[model samples]
Target chain A: RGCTVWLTGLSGAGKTTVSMALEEYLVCHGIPCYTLDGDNIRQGLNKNLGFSPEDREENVRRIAEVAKLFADAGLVCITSFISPYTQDRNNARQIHEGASLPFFEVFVDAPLHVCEQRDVEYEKPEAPELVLKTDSCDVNDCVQQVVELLQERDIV
Target chain B: RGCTVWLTGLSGAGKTTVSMALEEYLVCHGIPCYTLDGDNIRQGLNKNLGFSPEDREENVRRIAEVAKLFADAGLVCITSFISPYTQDRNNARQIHEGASLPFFEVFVDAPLHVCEQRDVKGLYKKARAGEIKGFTGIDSEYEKPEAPELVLKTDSCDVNDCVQQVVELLQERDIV
Candidate 1:
């Protein structure tokens, strides 16, 4: 079965950039994949939600449920969001049916100093999963690392 | 920096079993790690919280925050809970700082029939008997992960093999 790879981190953490790059990599490899960046999704499906914690929870919950559906249909769904909360991430995990799908937390670990320099407003949260230090690692390298990780798991 | 690995799934899906196995593996390899099983925590920190969905969220939220603290201290923390709600899981993800800590979902997959058949006290039976309300996998809804970093088949893989897989994953990611 296909799976949703949730890439979450602080702003300027290279979520969208890396997600797009990963999507390209997957596509080139002939893996059915798509990306759901927060900005893009918010402008469309989650436009109504605000930035409140509760709203964020709802936003993530909805996206997770949708991602689960997509995975069930045998597509690799990649979600990029500043989820900002562990509960939201866990909620996304719960939406997958019987854990048959793979949920990966790709942490774009850009230091606060670097993110501020990049003009990206975000607060980094400690999470559980595979975390990449984006500030130190090149964007492409980070994406490549994630691809390699997935490939090792035979997900790609 | 340390990381958090959360295992969420059904009752007989092997959350505790796999988490313990992973903890032992990490320790053997000299990786600083600890496992926080649901029942053990509930027996102490979350003893007051009932089985209600709201309480469940609180239970998970508190654990997530604690796990965040542990990760910040450069220790890998693993937690296994049957947290059947999406909102609760999301809360745990948000508690960590810098997003430097890796958040992994190790989903244990097992069919309900198999779980019920292996039920010791027939917990499912008790839930079905209305003797237990708000129990996961019965009256209460158990939300399966939409996407997990690793989804292991508990019914098929032995605990030792599962631990090896988790350890190998951490090593591959250079987290340990």
Candidate 2:
């Protein structure tokens, strides 16, 4: 069985950094894990894509699909994106079915005021699976919480 | 430094079966490779999904993205899909940039008569009955490869021969 742990939040919410941290932790524990950071994917596979709504859908759609494949291959797939719409997120969730590929959504939550103060560039989405306050919670703590969630789910 | 191999064709065109064989051959030679099959995927991750054109596009879109990830990790990724549309296939090719993930399209060409004969389960009958909507090569459309990097006629050769032909193609591209 394969599992996808998706991290979603506004920009500067630490989704990318925390996802990377969690990826390293999972790999260290001998779990085959990979992180799909926005910048990394954008600079590589999605270079020609833009930030329009259609492009955003395309962007997230592509990442979600890729993560599903990794999960199918029995690897823990982690992805960080500023997925601002519930429908898009739901579409991503639908990628994994049955017991083989389970989808987990972790929302990196921070107040818009705090996000703006942190110089986050993108607008935040309304809902997500697990919400974490970026301003109050340390990055390591967020990572630890996710790790715990994985453990509880027996996904690790 | 990794390559993206896209295999597209109709059902029973030997897309999934051949892709698996190719993956095994590559892995046996110490090449890190991965294959994505439609039946295996629908049986598990995409079980809730149906055979709609929209769903099919979404299906291939996701597979392409995952292939990009494997290529990013420096592994040769082979995706076998029924990708009956050119736009979807081209969208996949456009995903990976800088030649880091070189995209190669392989057409698994099989005749419709042969496929219909091998249908066995009355799937073709269902399609003809209109019970099955968006059925590729039946009620819906199946865009053949325009400029594929490789084309293998699965009906003419055995699995091993097909595998050898793919290996030679990869070698010609300096992939092996």
Candidate 3:
């Protein structure tokens, strides 16, 4: 079985940190997994896209579709993107849920000051599947929360 | 190591057949593998594309980019498409090679006579009656690979044999 764990937050909120730890944990525990982050995605698949709102949404759309494809192929697809728009994030969720694949939206939260260290635009998730308070909690604890969620859903 | 095995051939030339069997073979042997073909590509990533030459080239380009992603993610990404234009196919190869990824261009060949005879999807028949315009191997030209890394004669080989040839190629490259 496969599932997608979408980590969305302000840039400096530990989304990257938590996603890396979660991926390593999953792979170490014998699960096939991979992460799609801006480093790899913007460099390759979405390299042509600019940072304008339209381009950003298109970027999120492609990432979501590819994650759906990976999940469909039975690999845990972890996507760490600062997807700040509610509609775009929901569209990503719908893309997976419509395919009948498991989708988890994890809001990696931190203090505004830490995040000003982050993005031009940011929107908090209304009903995220999980929230990691990176401002206080360590990376391992945040990763544990995500892993526990996957376990509860029988994805692990 | 991760690599992409690109299968290009005429319609009904067994590209799909070989790809499906090869993916199953690799997975059974404990390798993570996936296939990207027209059925999946045309419906999603390249869904906005049409059958025009420009659209077809973009179609090949996007598939190449995605295959590169899957390969970088440490999986063998097999892509089966007609991809009849030499320039388009070479572009696909360059996209991978530029990223320092291994790309094997496998030419799946069946004589045009055999291909027309099979016409499994009835695409050829439609093209013949002018029901489909600009179809490769019918109205449009199919620019065969000048120096593909591998070639499988689907007319003379069964699907399993075609798949084994590719399996051997991957193993030889230590990508399996």
Candidate 4:
């Protein structure tokens, strides 16, 4: 019934900053939207899940399902997670496509050296729909880049 | 951020019927609303839960949390569950109240004999035959609400009337 903008990035790669701002921007400007951020979700629905490979997979799985639920209600859903695996992101894409929902994967790109301060077991997306480089540029500019992408796609 | 109309009743208490009608009535009339029915929920977030006392408690707890999230989005969230225990329903009310959101406990009242015949899911029949244990109104106890904000008498009440009753309750409480 609606679309989801899935933002994938490392801890310091600016996905959280851009995502929170994007949600506030989109919802304020007229389109109904909400953000399902990683840590906030970990505190609730996926509390039983953990950081192991299998656990991370399950965590991504549940968030995708919940995002689809919100999208099906005709509200734009923004999901921001580390989501470091190609297979996991593809799995989410398949589920959203199976449900006939629009799924946009935006890779918040930053080199490992830039994200070295806070490290986790990370993976990368092979075929993201959009990529925003945040390490060298300003975060507000990064947020505006995502806004322009959404506008280019007529999602804004 | 918003209000939740929490419907608690028995298995055959026509909660599904009333909730859908109520949601349609409210949303069409102006206020936005959607239902989070018990059966539909068991297939999703509460799939891990069971029919035991502790499981039921957890089930109610999770649904309340989700409903609060929906309310936080400024949608009129309607939740229909056979929350059989006073304590469990109270816990849900406390959570919503603690968040400073409006929580209305609408007790959908239907007697055991009436629900026995109106068994759409065969839950009443199964509970009576001992095929299912801990089923409310039969093997298990169905606690009536001691202080519900609204008591909807669904048996003698018409479906449209029941829906209107809820809408009126919302209006009276300034929820809509």
Candidate 5:
């Protein structure tokens, strides 16, 4: 009965920017949310792992499963990770599918030049459920947009 | 702000039973509670681990840190495990203490004789018979906690009273 809001983008992209705002915004609007920042988790939860392709897969795998449990505990999760591979996101999505949890993939998009963190990726994902314009868009605006989407989807 | 209710006990000491009942009671009373059961976690979260002494220690380590994070995210965590070592439990306690998150130790206490699926010590008998190995309170020793927030004896105390004991403790601590 919990939904995971997965935010993906480059390292310097607005993924973190939007996620922090999303946490504040969601909590203010009565949606209990937790932000599982990749860098923060790497320092602890996934600290035993690395940044290799296999490591990245395991990273998302653990995050998704944990997010589902968090959702099961009744929290709308706001997760921000590089999640570069096209398939890394799917394992989480499919895992959520196998369980009674809803998963939403939000692509935090921005001009390539503005994305300072050069976390590269494989073939891009197709048709994200929601896309936020972080390059030129205001962070508050993106926060509002997510609220609307979560509300529309009954995920909040 | 939230807290983790760490339920430490032997294998047949009614940890899971009390935990599930407490979860229902706490949630109905408006405390957002989630039970991270030892067996269930073993099947998943800590599935990669074995029953070796080292592996078992790591299992508790990860659960402690994860429970801390869950508490950070603002949910009351109820975790049940047969933490057989004093050092292992201390690490979890110290970790939560370092973060200023209240880690409440709930010692689900039942005399070893009464904890064997009944008054027979049937479970321990199995361990002695080699049907089970590395069982807490049998092959593995259960180190008593110096202090605990709650001591629940399912052998004598009714489930409701045990649940209320914890609720009152949480209330007194201003955690609920």
Candidate 6:
């Protein structure tokens, strides 16, 4: 009944905007969903962390752990993180799937030109569960794409 | 509909025992509640933390922040920690109250004699042997709560009774 929808993308790739809309939609439909992003997490749980490489990794790691806890406690935790590193993202997936929990990595794939219009090694996911081309579609379209995936996985 | 029940006590004081029982009761009774203690946290989110004072403070603060998030996300977060310092407990309460979330500090009050006798994890024995340094209520001072919302005398009360008292508090606050 709970899962993690991890959105990884660049600065203007609509991670925050899409996550906000998705959260609203899920809540409206009676799903207990919460967004974990820099705004809420960095300011509180990770306030001690800085922009160094180690700190960045720790930041993603901590968020991943917290997201797992939320999912374990029965909430569809939507994480909107820049999360440009592939190894870190893999570790996040490993921990969730290792615990027999559902984890969906949604690559917010957007072209650089479109991203500039809107708004990292940005290691593209080799096998992400879902990939939303935020450049071509609108926010609602992305939200629908995710909602459909969640429905398919029996998470809704 | 969500809140945090902060369980503070010394080791072997039945914090973990009471928390597990209370969590099961809440879940069985249709209230979604999860317990966050040292095992799940120290092994994961706080694996980097050590026994230093700064690390101890950070541990308490991080747990407080996570409990607040869980409460905000619609779960009754029950934290079972040896949050021995009053300042740390106060900070935990401060953050939850600051977020407009109800945080009830339930002091799991157990006499030192009873706590050492129980020694659930052999921690008290280890502390006595000097194997564990800076243990709460042993080498490190456990600052008792001046005014907690509820005090569970684990030395006399059983786990079910302790859990019921917590449920009563939740009911009084209309949280259950």
- DockQ result, candidate 3: 0.61
Q: Which stretches of candidate 3 lie over 4 Å from their true place?
A: A117-120
Measured by lDDT, the strongest candidate is 6
Query: How good is model 5 by TM-score?
Result: 0.90
Q: What alpha-carbon RMSD in Å does predicted model 3 have with respect to the real structure?
A: 1.8
Model 1 residue B77 distance off true place after TM-score fit, in angstroms: 0.7
Instruction: Compute DockQ for each candidate against the true complex.
Output: 0.02, 0.17, 0.61, 0.36, 0.55, 0.79
When summed lDDT is taken over every stretch of 10 residues in candidate 2 chain A, the lowest stretch is A120-129
lDDT of 5 at B156: 87
Of the two candidates 2 and 3, the one with more favorable TM-score, higher being better, is 3
Task: Give the docking tier of candidate 4.
Answer: acceptable
lDDT of the structure predicted as candidate 6: 0.89
Instruction: Extract clashing residue pairs from model 2.
Output: A65-B62, A66-B66, A97-B45
Clashing pairs in 3: A115-A118
lDDT-better candidate, 2 vs 6: 6
Looking at candidate 1 chain A, the ten consecutive residues that score lowest on lDDT are A120-129
lDDT of each: 0.73, 0.77, 0.88, 0.80, 0.80, 0.89
Best-to-worst DockQ order: 6, 3, 5, 4, 2, 1
- Candidate 5 chain B lDDT trough over 10 residues, lowest sum: B114-123
Alpha-carbon DockQ of candidate 1 = 0.02
lDDT value, residue B172 of candidate 1 = 83
Order the candidates by lDDT, highest first — what do you get?
6, 3, 5, 4, 2, 1
Instruction: Estimate, for each residue in B38-146, the C-alpha lDDT of model 4 and write its tens digit.
Output: 5547866676679899899888877887777677767788898988999989988887787788999999998888888888877877777888887887888889999
What TM-score would chain B receive for each of the candidates shown? 0.92, 0.89, 0.97, 0.95, 0.92, 0.97
Docking class of 3: medium
lDDT of 1 by residue, B22-139 (tens): 8777778767666667554675446557887778877787677556645654567888888788777776776553445677777778877778888856798888889988778878
Candidate 1 vs candidate 4, DockQ winner:
4
Which is superior by DockQ, 2 or 5? 5
| Per-residue accuracy of model 1 over A16-78 as CA lDDT, tens digit each | 888888888888887766566654456444655697877777777767755664565355778
RMSD of every candidate to native, in Å, equals: 15.7, 5.4, 1.8, 2.9, 2.8, 1.9
Candidate 5 pairs with clashing backbones: A12-A117
